[PDB]
Amino acid sequence: AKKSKIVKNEQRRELVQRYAERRAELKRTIRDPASSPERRAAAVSALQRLPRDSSPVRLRNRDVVDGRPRGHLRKFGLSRVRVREMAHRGELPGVRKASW
Amino acid sequence: MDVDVSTDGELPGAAEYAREKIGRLSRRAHRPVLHARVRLTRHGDPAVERPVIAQANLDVNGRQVRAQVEGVNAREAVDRLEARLRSRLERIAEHWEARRGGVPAE
């Protein structure tokens, strides 16, 4: 798509692995049990202070080379346009046209 | 008769002119017309000698009558579209006066 947006997606992923791995997950563990004292702890407020880009909810599965944000397939990490072209060329092992 | 015009780009005044020019053809149709639509488009490339493209579709009692013309401006395209639609409706009539010379005789 756009080079800047392809890059920014990756930057979100490295931000996610750096922050969402433990910082943005221990706060969730605090909020889960009503027994846990969340209200004074401000685990909500502390987790607000974290960057938005820490949250995986901001991620977007784009095509691994093409950058296409829609028509994505999780098995291949490829757009529907690219999967069709590489399967036809025999590039994805064990993939072929269907009949039944 | 009510017409909907789906213009495109910058065609100021084309919608009203097309509406009033096409709505006059209701009397020409020998059967009631339903949901008569028009569409105006302009070619982006300046290399086209007739950039404006006009399309019209009418539903005369279930029979679809469509026409398409090209022109240098909205007014010329609308006028040519009106002439084309008039010719099509003339050829569509199907009433007795237009189907009396083809019925076997003698």
Binding site: G71, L73, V83, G94, R96, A98 | -
Partner: protein
């Protein structure tokens, strides 16, 4: 008894793998249950042909995984070493449990 699980994208490759696997384990002198087939697993995906619009034109693709199961008995260390000393085609995987 240990299970040898054979998964392949290719039918002929899976058959060859089973055949020489049983060949070497019966060379080493072990009782084999034979290449028991397992249900083929099918993955199906439907895509649209054209880059833009034209939704009504679709392509289907599938991926087919064939599965073979080998069960042997009397696991002598000679058979164990022979098993760890086998070269296999890259289409076929081996799971030893």
């Amino acid at each position: 008894k240990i299970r040898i699980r054979l998964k392949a994208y290719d039918h002929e490759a899976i058959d060859a793998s089973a055949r020489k696997i049983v060949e070497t384990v019966t060379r080493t002198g072990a009782s084999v249950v034979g290449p028991v087939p397992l249900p083929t697993e099918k993955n199906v995906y439907c895509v649209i042909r054209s880059p833009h619009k034209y939704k009504d034109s679709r392509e289907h693709f599938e991926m087919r995984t064939h599965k073979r199961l080998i069960d042997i008995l009397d696991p002598t260390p000679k058979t164990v070493d022979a098993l760890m000393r086998i070269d296999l085609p890259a289409s076929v995987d081996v799971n030893i449990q």
